[PDB]
Design a protein around this ligand. Sequence first.
Ligand code: TTP
Ligand code: MG
Ligand code: MG
Length: 280
Amino acid sequence: MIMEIPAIKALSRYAQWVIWKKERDTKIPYNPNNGKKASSTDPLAWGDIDEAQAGLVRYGANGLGFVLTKSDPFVFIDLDHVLDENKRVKCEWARQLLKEIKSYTEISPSGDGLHVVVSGKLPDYIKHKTKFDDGSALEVYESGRYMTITGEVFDGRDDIKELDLSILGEFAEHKILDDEAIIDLMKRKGQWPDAPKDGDDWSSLDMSFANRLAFWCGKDIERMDRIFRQSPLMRQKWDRPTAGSTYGRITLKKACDFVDSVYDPALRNESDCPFEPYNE
Ligand SMILES: Cc1cn([C@H]2C[C@H](O)[C@@H](COP(=O)(O)OP(=O)(O)OP(=O)(O)O)O2)c(=O)[nH]c1=O
Ligand SMILES: [Mg+2]
Ligand SMILES: [Mg+2]
């Protein structure tokens, strides 16, 4: 019946279909024609809907997916954790968005979220993902991402509409070596920390990690802070005030004074690191 849905017929015009399978907390896209993992940039890693349907039964994947590209007219709106046990809307921001963006709406594969597919253009001043105290979240994309396709039409909104999307500025938040290269470096050296366990002195885990950051970041405390905030050791205590500074700032400053040598990107003195790798 999926091809009966007018919105699915609209998506089936494009050979931008994939299949996906649940891997722990994630949904990995796969090439429907050979079962290999699919890039979101390689068009020949995708197929048309017929090939996606066949690959779905062949590899026993969880469902269909559609890769969004710049040239196609579709915008993908991801609403997470906005539904009831009854698959009923419980978040007021999601209820207001649905009142102002009436287009194809389907229930996401976890049963507690929603997808809205619209024809239009995203405002250029909004974040891709917005998280709310609620625990729900709003995620919007028009290219460089795939979306799962369920066909579970919500409220009979089964047609992709052409709508203005300037209204999304009322829901999403606004926005105006490198860190990622350093993070990958520390991971390959095994200097990236695990999440703390039961009975772990978190504060000394912070200090050990801060000492490693001082070396690999060249004692650039701003970069040390940006990288720490993306680590499994980040918590609210990092920004709690303490003696006219923050706990995180005092930790990073003590690491900068404690640590002797530094990693020089031009000298590649990875062997000068004084700390053994984290065990596994
Ligand atoms: C590469 C990749 C893409 N995606 C894509 C596919 C998702 O449809 C889309 C939105 O992320 P999610 O909201 O986490 O997944 P979902 O909306 O399809 O299902 P639900 O929210 O009900 O659990 O991001 C992943 O989720 N994980 C990945 O690893
Ligand atoms: Mg979702
Ligand atoms: Mg697009």
